Amino acid sequence: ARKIGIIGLGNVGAAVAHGLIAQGVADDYVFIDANEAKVKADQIDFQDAMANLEAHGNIVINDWAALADADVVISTLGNIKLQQFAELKFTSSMVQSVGTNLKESGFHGVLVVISNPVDVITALFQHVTGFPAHKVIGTGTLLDTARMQRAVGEAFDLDPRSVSGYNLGEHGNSQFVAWSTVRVMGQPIVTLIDLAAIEEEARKGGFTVLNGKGYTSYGVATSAIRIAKAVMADAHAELVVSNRRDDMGMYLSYPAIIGRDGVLAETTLDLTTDEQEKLLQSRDYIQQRFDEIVDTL
Amino acid sequence: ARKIGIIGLGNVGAAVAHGLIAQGVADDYVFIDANEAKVKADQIDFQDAMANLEAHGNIVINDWAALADADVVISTLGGDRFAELKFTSSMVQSVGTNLKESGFHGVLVVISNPVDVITALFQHVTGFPAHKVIGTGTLLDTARMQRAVGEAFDLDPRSVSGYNLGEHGNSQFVAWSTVRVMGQPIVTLADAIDLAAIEEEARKGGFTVLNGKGYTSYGVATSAIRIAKAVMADAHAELVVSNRRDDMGMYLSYPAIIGRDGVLAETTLDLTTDEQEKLLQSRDYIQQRFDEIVDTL
Amino acid sequence: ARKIGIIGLGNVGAAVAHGLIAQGVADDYVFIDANEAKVKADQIDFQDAMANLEAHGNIVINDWAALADADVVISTLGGDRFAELKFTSSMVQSVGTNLKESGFHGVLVVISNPVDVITALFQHVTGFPAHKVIGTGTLLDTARMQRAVGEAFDLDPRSVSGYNLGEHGNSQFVAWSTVRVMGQPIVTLADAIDLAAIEEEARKGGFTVLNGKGYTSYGVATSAIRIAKAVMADAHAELVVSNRRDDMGMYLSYPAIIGRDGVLAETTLDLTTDEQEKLLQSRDYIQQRFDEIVDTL
Amino acid sequence: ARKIGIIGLGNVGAAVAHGLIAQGVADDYVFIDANEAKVKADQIDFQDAMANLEAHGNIVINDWAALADADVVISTLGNIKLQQFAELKFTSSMVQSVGTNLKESGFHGVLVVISNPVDVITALFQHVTGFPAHKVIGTGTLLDTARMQRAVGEAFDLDPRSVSGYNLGEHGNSQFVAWSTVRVMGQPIVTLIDLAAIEEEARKGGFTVLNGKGYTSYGVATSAIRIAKAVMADAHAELVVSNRRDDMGMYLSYPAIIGRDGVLAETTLDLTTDEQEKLLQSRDYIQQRFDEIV
Ligand SMILES: NC(=O)c1ccc[n+]([C@@H]2O[C@H](COP(=O)([O-])OP(=O)(O)OC[C@H]3O[C@@H](n4cnc5c(N)ncnc54)[C@H](O)[C@@H]3O)[C@@H](O)[C@H]2O)c1
Ligand SMILES: NC(=O)c1ccc[n+]([C@@H]2O[C@H](COP(=O)([O-])OP(=O)(O)OC[C@H]3O[C@@H](n4cnc5c(N)ncnc54)[C@H](O)[C@@H]3O)[C@@H](O)[C@H]2O)c1
Ligand SMILES: NC(=O)c1ccc[n+]([C@@H]2O[C@H](COP(=O)([O-])OP(=O)(O)OC[C@H]3O[C@@H](n4cnc5c(N)ncnc54)[C@H](O)[C@@H]3O)[C@@H](O)[C@H]2O)c1
Ligand SMILES: NC(=O)c1ccc[n+]([C@@H]2O[C@H](COP(=O)([O-])OP(=O)(O)OC[C@H]3O[C@@H](n4cnc5c(N)ncnc54)[C@H](O)[C@@H]3O)[C@@H](O)[C@H]2O)c1
Known part of the structure; x- marks a missing residue:
C-alpha cells in the first residue's frame, strides 16, 4: 500500500x-x-x-x-514569518x-x-x-522551472506543459533559466520576445505571490507531489530536483532520473559556457553556507 | 465543458x-x-x-x-x-x-x-x-457524525448511514432514527454504545479544529465539491443540503435529490415525534433570523 | 507502493x-x-x-x-x-x-x-x-438491482441502499427488506411500484449484455476494483462479497467489513423469515456443489 | 458540463x-x-x-x-476483421x-x-x-510516437514520458521517426545503441499486439483521450495529430497546438533534409489515395 x-x-x-x-x-x-x-x-x-x-x-x-x-x-x-x-x-x-x-x-x-x-x-x-x-x-x-514555463506559456499562449527547458542552480538566490534548453513549438526559444522580461516574470513571480497572500503553497506542493508519485511508481522520470551530482560535490538543481530508490541516474546537459559558469557559482554559494552551518548541528 | x-x-x-x-x-x-x-x-x-x-x-x-x-x-x-x-x-x-x-x-x-x-x-x-x-x-455536520460513529465502531465513515438535520451552526441535531451501522439501526445497538457521547465527539471535533487552526476548511470545502459534481453530472444523488421544502416554507437541511437543475425532488424521512419536533424548532429559528436580516436590506 | x-x-x-x-x-x-x-x-x-x-x-x-x-x-x-x-x-x-x-x-x-x-x-x-x-x-447483482431501482425512481444508483444476498448465478435474491429509496423503505412504497418487475428488469439486463456482447466485463470488473481499493486503503468498508460466515460455515454473499487483512468483521441484517429461508436454501446449494467438485480433486 | x-x-x-x-x-x-x-x-x-x-x-x-x-x-x-x-x-x-x-x-x-x-x-x-x-x-x-517512446524508454530504462520527439507522416505506412527531434537524458538520441533496432520495435510493435490478440486498443484509446482532454480544457497543448497544414494542403501528422476550437496553431520543426523528403513522400501517398477514393 x-x-x-x-x-x-x-x-x-x-x-x-x-x-x-x-x-x-x-x-x-x-x-x-x-x-x-x-x-x-x-x-x-x-x-x-x-x-x-x-x-x-x-x-x-x-x-x-x-x-x-x-x-x-x-x-x-x-517558519514563513522569516521569509515575509x-x-x-x-x-x-x-x-x-x-x-x-x-x-x-x-x-x-x-x-x-x-x-x-x-x-x-x-x-x-x-x-x-x-x-x-x-x-x-x-x-x-522544479518550482522555478514551473514559473518559467508559466511565463513562457503566457507569452506564446501555450500549455505550460508544452514548454521544455530547465532552471538550474540554487533555489531562491542564484538559480537561472538555461535558455539553451528551452524550446517552444518546435523551435529553441533563443532563435525566437524579451527573454529577460520572461525571466523577470519567472524570478519575481514568487515574490508577487508571497507579497500578495503571505506565503506560496500550490506551486511547490504540486512539485513535491509530482516527485512523490515518481518515487512510489518507480517511473524513472527525468525531473529537475536538488540532487548531489558527483562532479558538483554539493547539492544543487540539475535534471536527474527518479524512481523508487531516489536518484537512479544523472543527466547531461550541453550548457553554454555562460550557463556552466553560473552553475558553478550556485555550487559555490550553497557549498559555503553549508560549510558555515554543518559544524553547528 | x-x-x-x-x-x-x-x-x-x-x-x-x-x-x-x-x-x-x-x-x-x-x-x-x-x-x-x-x-x-x-x-x-x-x-x-x-x-x-x-x-x-x-x-x-x-x-x-x-x-x-x-x-x-x-x-x-x-x-x-x-x-x-x-x-x-x-x-x-x-x-x-x-x-x-x-x-x-x-x-x-x-x-x-x-x-x-x-x-x-x-x-x-x-x-x-x-x-x-x-x-x-x-452535510458537514453529518460527515462529522459519520466520523465519530465510524471511530466508535472502527468503520469507514462512508459506511455509516443517517443524517444531521435542521439548522447548521446551532439547533441542528443527529436524527439517530436514520443512522445504521453494520446492518443494524444504531438505536438498537444503543439499547443493548452511548449515543450522547458520540454526539459530543462530533461537536467537540469542530472545536478542536477551530482551536488549533482558527478555522475549518477541508471538511466544508469537500462538501461543496461533492454537491458541485452531483450538479454537473446530473446525478440525481440524494444529499442532505440546505433547501426550501414546500412543507417547511423556509430553508433548512434535509435530504433532497440533486441534479443539474438543482433540487430535483424532496425525500421523506419517517422521523420520530421528538425528531419531528426538533426539526420544526430549527425551522422557526431560521425563520426568525431570516425576517430579522431581510429587514435591514 | x-x-x-x-x-x-x-x-x-x-x-x-x-x-x-x-x-x-x-x-x-x-x-x-x-x-x-x-x-x-x-x-x-x-x-x-x-x-x-x-x-x-x-x-x-x-x-x-x-x-x-x-x-x-x-x-x-x-x-x-x-x-x-x-x-x-x-x-x-x-x-x-x-x-x-x-x-x-x-x-x-x-x-x-x-x-x-x-x-x-x-x-x-x-x-x-x-x-x-x-x-x-x-456485489454485481446488487449494483444491477440499484440500476433497475434507480432507473425506476429516476435516481442515482449510488443512492439506492440494500442488497442482493446468496449465491451468485442462481439462488441469489434481492433482500427487499434492506432496500431504501428517498428515505423510505421500498416495501412500503410498493404497498402504495412493482418490485417483481424491478427484480426481473435487473436480471433481464444481464441477459441483454450477454446477448449483445457475449459476456459482461465492466460491471463485474468495477466490483473487483472497488473491493481492491477497500483492501489497500484498509477502509473497513461495508461491502457485500462472497465470504465465509461462522453461522453459515460455507461461502455465500452477505455484507462484511473489508480492510487490508480481508474480512475484518461480519454484519447482522434483520432479514424477514422468507429472506432467511432463501438464504439458507442458497447456502445448501453452494455446499452441495462444492462437495461435488472438491470430490474430483 | x-x-x-x-x-x-x-x-x-x-x-x-x-x-x-x-x-x-x-x-x-x-x-x-x-x-x-x-x-x-x-x-x-x-x-x-x-x-x-x-x-x-x-x-x-x-x-x-x-x-x-x-x-x-x-x-x-x-471493421477490424478486415485487418486480420x-x-x-x-x-x-x-x-x-x-x-x-x-x-x-x-x-x-x-x-x-x-x-x-x-x-x-x-x-x-x-x-x-x-x-x-x-x-x-x-x-x-500520436500512437506511433507513443510506441517510439516505449521502445526508447525500454532501451534507456526511462519513463516513456521523459522521451521527447515525434514520428511524422502517414500512420500505418510511410510514417517515420524524426530522429533529429528525439532526445533523452538531456542529449540528442542520434549523439548517443542501434536506432534501427529501436525503430523496428516501434514500427512493428502494432503487428505484435495485433497478432497477439487480434486488435489493438489501449494505446490508441489513450491517445484519443489525451486529445479530447486538451480540447475540453482548452489547453493549447502541443500534440502530434493528423491535421491539415497549409504548406502540405493535405492531412498528415505533424505537431499542432490543440484547444477547444481544434487546431489553434501550427508548429515548425527544424527537420533534416531527409526527414523533409520523407514527409513530402508521405503527403503524396495521402494525397493520391485520397483523390483516388473521392
Ligand atoms: N523550496 C521551495 O520552493 C519553497 C516554496 C515555498 C515555501 N518553502 C518553504 O517551505 C517551509 C514551510 O513553508 P510554510 O509557508 O508552510 O511555513 P509555515 O510557517 O506556515 O509552516 C511551517 C510548519 O512547520 C512546523 N514546524 C516547525 N518546526 C518543526 C519541527 N522541528 N518539526 C515538525 N514541524 C515543525 C511549524 O509548526 C509549522 O506548522 C518554509 O521553509 C518555506 O521557506 C519552500
Ligand atoms: N458551513 C460551515 O460549516 C462552515 C465551515 C467553515 C466556514 N464557514 C463559513 O464560510 C465563510 C468563509 O470563511 P473563510 O475562513 O473562508 O473566510 P476568510 O475570512 O478567510 O475569507 C473570506 C474571503 O471573502 C472575500 N470577500 C469579502 N467580501 C467580499 C465581497 N463583498 N465580494 C467578494 N469577495 C469578498 C475576502 O476578501 C476573503 O478573501 C464564513 O461564512 C464562514 O463562517 C462555514
Ligand atoms: N461473477 C460474475 O458475475 C461474472 C461476470 C462475468 C464473468 N465472470 C467469470 O469470469 C471468468 C472469466 O471470464 P472472461 O470472459 O474474462 O474469460 P475469457 O475466456 O475471456 O478469458 C479467461 C482468460 O484466462 C486465461 N487462462 C485460462 N486458464 C488459465 C490458467 N490455468 N492460468 C492462467 N491463465 C489462464 C486464458 O488465457 C484467458 O485469457 C469466468 O469464470 C466467467 O464466468 C463472472
Ligand atoms: N488510427 C489508428 O492508429 C488506429 C489504431 C487502432 C485501431 N484503429 C481503427 O479503429 C477502427 C475501429 O477498430 P476496432 O478494433 O474497434 O474495430 P471493431 O470492428 O471491433 O469496431 C468497429 C465498430 O464500428 C461499428 N460500425 C461500423 N460501421 C458503423 C456505422 N456506419 N455507424 C456506426 N457504427 C459503425 C461496428 O458495429 C463496430 O462495433 C478500425 O478502423 C481500426 O483500424 C485505428
Whole structure:
C-alpha cells in the first residue's frame, strides 16, 4: 500500500496533504508537527472530509515509528514569518532532531525536502540522517522551472506543459533559466520576445505571490507531489530536483532520473559556457553556507 | 465543458479551488474576491502548479461576465450587531445583484454562517428559483457524525448511514432514527454504545479544529465539491443540503435529490415525534433570523 | 507502493487492468495468463498507452515470484460435466499452489462462476485464512438491482441502499427488506411500484449484455476494483462479497467489513423469515456443489 | 458540463469509453453504433458499473440529436476483421452517411478520427461534413510516437514520458521517426545503441499486439483521450495529430497546438533534409489515395 509522511503541517505541508488526499494518492498518511494543536486540527478536519471524499486515506499524527514503512517522507517544516535563506537559522536548528528521529524510526524510503533554503537543508538532512545521498533530494528548481514555463506559456499562449527547458542552480538566490534548453513549438526559444522580461516574470513571480497572500503553497506542493508519485511508481522520470551530482560535490538543481530508490541516474546537459559558469557559482554559494552551518548541528 | 465560479477566495474558497484543481474537475475557473492582491496571488500560484499537474484548468479572476455560462457557482461569503447585519445583507445584495446581472443561470451553492439564512437571502435577492439556490447545510455536520460513529465502531465513515438535520451552526441535531451501522439501526445497538457521547465527539471535533487552526476548511470545502459534481453530472444523488421544502416554507437541511437543475425532488424521512419536533424548532429559528436580516436590506 | 496481480487476462481481466491503469491506482502490476501471446500483446498495448497517460504503472507478465509482495490478487479464472469439474478443480489447484508457493500473503479476490464454489475451492487449496479469500459474489447483482431501482425512481444508483444476498448465478435474491429509496423503505412504497418487475428488469439486463456482447466485463470488473481499493486503503468498508460466515460455515454473499487483512468483521441484517429461508436454501446449494467438485480433486 | 460522443463501440470504442468512465472524465456520453445490440449491451454494462464507480456519467445510445452540444465526438467505426489499408473500402462507405448525420445533428465541437486509414478518413470526414479543417483532426502518429517512446524508454530504462520527439507522416505506412527531434537524458538520441533496432520495435510493435490478440486498443484509446482532454480544457497543448497544414494542403501528422476550437496553431520543426523528403513522400501517398477514393 502507499504511505506518505509529512513533517511540518503549515501552509505548504497542508496543501501537499490536501493535493494527495483529494486525488486519493496514498492509503496511509503520517502528519508530524511540533505544534500539537495545529496538526490535530488538520487531522480531524481531513477526517471530517472522508465521508464526502471518493477515496479513503488513514491519518495518524506525531508518530515517528509509523514512518518505518513509508515510501516517501516530505519535509515542509520552517517558519514563513522569516521569509515575509534568513530562515536558515530556524530550519537548520530543526534538522538535527528531525533528522535523528527520522533515522531512528527505521525509515528507508526517499526523503523529499521543501524547507528553505532547500539546497542547504537538503544537504544537512543527508548529513544528519546518514541516508545515501540518492535517497535525499529537494524540490529545488522544479518550482522555478514551473514559473518559467508559466511565463513562457503566457507569452506564446501555450500549455505550460508544452514548454521544455530547465532552471538550474540554487533555489531562491542564484538559480537561472538555461535558455539553451528551452524550446517552444518546435523551435529553441533563443532563435525566437524579451527573454529577460520572461525571466523577470519567472524570478519575481514568487515574490508577487508571497507579497500578495503571505506565503506560496500550490506551486511547490504540486512539485513535491509530482516527485512523490515518481518515487512510489518507480517511473524513472527525468525531473529537475536538488540532487548531489558527483562532479558538483554539493547539492544543487540539475535534471536527474527518479524512481523508487531516489536518484537512479544523472543527466547531461550541453550548457553554454555562460550557463556552466553560473552553475558553478550556485555550487559555490550553497557549498559555503553549508560549510558555515554543518559544524553547528 | 465544465466551468466553476468561486466567490470569496479565503480559507474555504482556496481549499475548494485546490480540491477541484488537484483532481482536474473543471476546465474553466472564475475566482472572485474583493482583495485583488490575494486572488491574483492565488491565481498565479495555481498557474505555477499547472506545469506539474496532470489536468489543465484555466483561471480568470474578478470578471463577473465570465460567470454567464458557469455550471455551478460557490459562494463562501458570510449597535454593532445591527451594523453587522446591515453590512452582511448589503454584501449579499451586491454580490447577488451582480451575479444575477451576469446572466448566470446554473446552480448556486452557498457556504456561510448562518448558512440557511444566508442561502435564503441569496435566493431572495437574486430572484433565482429556490431549487437552484442551495447551501451546504448539515452535510458537514453529518460527515462529522459519520466520523465519530465510524471511530466508535472502527468503520469507514462512508459506511455509516443517517443524517444531521435542521439548522447548521446551532439547533441542528443527529436524527439517530436514520443512522445504521453494520446492518443494524444504531438505536438498537444503543439499547443493548452511548449515543450522547458520540454526539459530543462530533461537536467537540469542530472545536478542536477551530482551536488549533482558527478555522475549518477541508471538511466544508469537500462538501461543496461533492454537491458541485452531483450538479454537473446530473446525478440525481440524494444529499442532505440546505433547501426550501414546500412543507417547511423556509430553508433548512434535509435530504433532497440533486441534479443539474438543482433540487430535483424532496425525500421523506419517517422521523420520530421528538425528531419531528426538533426539526420544526430549527425551522422557526431560521425563520426568525431570516425576517430579522431581510429587514435591514 | 501498491502492487496488484491479475490471473487471467481475458475479457474481464483486461477490463480490470484497464480500469486500474486509467486511474493510476497501482504502481506495479503482475499479469498471469496461460496464453503468452495474449498477455504479451496486452502488456505492450498498455505500455504504448503510458506515454499519453497521466499516471505511471509497471507491468510484468507470467512471473509468479513477483506476486510475493502483491497487496491484492484478482483471479478471473472459471462424461462432459465430470470432465469439466475435473479440469476446473485441477486448474484451481495448480494456480492455488503456485500462488501459495510465491509467498503472496495479501487478499485474494475471486471473479468466477460459480464464484462462491470456486472461492471456497481456492481457500481450500491455498490454505489461506478464509478472511483473506473473498469472491465478488452478489456485489454485481446488487449494483444491477440499484440500476433497475434507480432507473425506476429516476435516481442515482449510488443512492439506492440494500442488497442482493446468496449465491451468485442462481439462488441469489434481492433482500427487499434492506432496500431504501428517498428515505423510505421500498416495501412500503410498493404497498402504495412493482418490485417483481424491478427484480426481473435487473436480471433481464444481464441477459441483454450477454446477448449483445457475449459476456459482461465492466460491471463485474468495477466490483473487483472497488473491493481492491477497500483492501489497500484498509477502509473497513461495508461491502457485500462472497465470504465465509461462522453461522453459515460455507461461502455465500452477505455484507462484511473489508480492510487490508480481508474480512475484518461480519454484519447482522434483520432479514424477514422468507429472506432467511432463501438464504439458507442458497447456502445448501453452494455446499452441495462444492462437495461435488472438491470430490474430483 | 462535459459531453463526449463515440461513434462505433468496437474494441477501440469501448476502450475509449472505459478510460473516460473509469476516470469520470465526462458527465454525459452518447454511444452510437450500427450494431444496436452491441451498443445497448455496453450501455447497460457501464450502467451496472455505476453503483461501484466513484464518479457519475450518463449514457444515451444512438441519438444523433444528443450530439448537438457534445464537446468532442470520437469516430472509432470500422471493421477490424478486415485487418486480420484493407478497411479503406469499408470505412469510406460509412463516412458519407455518418458525416451527413453528424453534420445535421447540430454538432459543432471537435471531431477526433481514429478509423483507419486515419489520415485519409480524417480528410474525407472534413470533406463530407464541411466542418472547418481545424475542427476535424485524427490521432495520426500520436500512437506511433507513443510506441517510439516505449521502445526508447525500454532501451534507456526511462519513463516513456521523459522521451521527447515525434514520428511524422502517414500512420500505418510511410510514417517515420524524426530522429533529429528525439532526445533523452538531456542529449540528442542520434549523439548517443542501434536506432534501427529501436525503430523496428516501434514500427512493428502494432503487428505484435495485433497478432497477439487480434486488435489493438489501449494505446490508441489513450491517445484519443489525451486529445479530447486538451480540447475540453482548452489547453493549447502541443500534440502530434493528423491535421491539415497549409504548406502540405493535405492531412498528415505533424505537431499542432490543440484547444477547444481544434487546431489553434501550427508548429515548425527544424527537420533534416531527409526527414523533409520523407514527409513530402508521405503527403503524396495521402494525397493520391485520397483523390483516388473521392
Ligand atoms: N523550496 C521551495 O520552493 C519553497 C516554496 C515555498 C515555501 N518553502 C518553504 O517551505 C517551509 C514551510 O513553508 P510554510 O509557508 O508552510 O511555513 P509555515 O510557517 O506556515 O509552516 C511551517 C510548519 O512547520 C512546523 N514546524 C516547525 N518546526 C518543526 C519541527 N522541528 N518539526 C515538525 N514541524 C515543525 C511549524 O509548526 C509549522 O506548522 C518554509 O521553509 C518555506 O521557506 C519552500
Ligand atoms: N458551513 C460551515 O460549516 C462552515 C465551515 C467553515 C466556514 N464557514 C463559513 O464560510 C465563510 C468563509 O470563511 P473563510 O475562513 O473562508 O473566510 P476568510 O475570512 O478567510 O475569507 C473570506 C474571503 O471573502 C472575500 N470577500 C469579502 N467580501 C467580499 C465581497 N463583498 N465580494 C467578494 N469577495 C469578498 C475576502 O476578501 C476573503 O478573501 C464564513 O461564512 C464562514 O463562517 C462555514
Ligand atoms: N461473477 C460474475 O458475475 C461474472 C461476470 C462475468 C464473468 N465472470 C467469470 O469470469 C471468468 C472469466 O471470464 P472472461 O470472459 O474474462 O474469460 P475469457 O475466456 O475471456 O478469458 C479467461 C482468460 O484466462 C486465461 N487462462 C485460462 N486458464 C488459465 C490458467 N490455468 N492460468 C492462467 N491463465 C489462464 C486464458 O488465457 C484467458 O485469457 C469466468 O469464470 C466467467 O464466468 C463472472
Ligand atoms: N488510427 C489508428 O492508429 C488506429 C489504431 C487502432 C485501431 N484503429 C481503427 O479503429 C477502427 C475501429 O477498430 P476496432 O478494433 O474497434 O474495430 P471493431 O470492428 O471491433 O469496431 C468497429 C465498430 O464500428 C461499428 N460500425 C461500423 N460501421 C458503423 C456505422 N456506419 N455507424 C456506426 N457504427 C459503425 C461496428 O458495429 C463496430 O462495433 C478500425 O478502423 C481500426 O483500424 C485505428
